[PDB]
Amino acid sequence: EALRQARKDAELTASADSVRAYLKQIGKVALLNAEEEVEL
């Protein structure tokens, strides 16, 4: 719906500030809860 389009526009925003861009970049990936760390 419109929510997906808004999310895509937000992710495609220029984000001229360097710190904001870095936060957006690091926010793309997920976390490891309990066991994936051992496997890695």
Partner: protein, 49 residues
């Protein structure tokens, strides 16, 4: 300004030597670009240092 540029360049050298992922290296290169731009003309792009 010269100290900031030299520090960021040395950190980029260390990151390349270690083998850091692409995100960290790209962030460091962007910081180096911003430091050089601020050195040559402070205030043209972004906020002044």
């Amino acid at each position: 300004l010269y100290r900031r540029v030299i520090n960021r360049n040395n950190r980029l050298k260390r990151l390349i030597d270690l083998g850091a992922p692409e995100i960290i290296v790209n962030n460091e290169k962007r910081m180096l670009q911003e430091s050089v731009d601020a050195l040559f003309d402070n205030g043209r792009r972004g906020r002044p240092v």
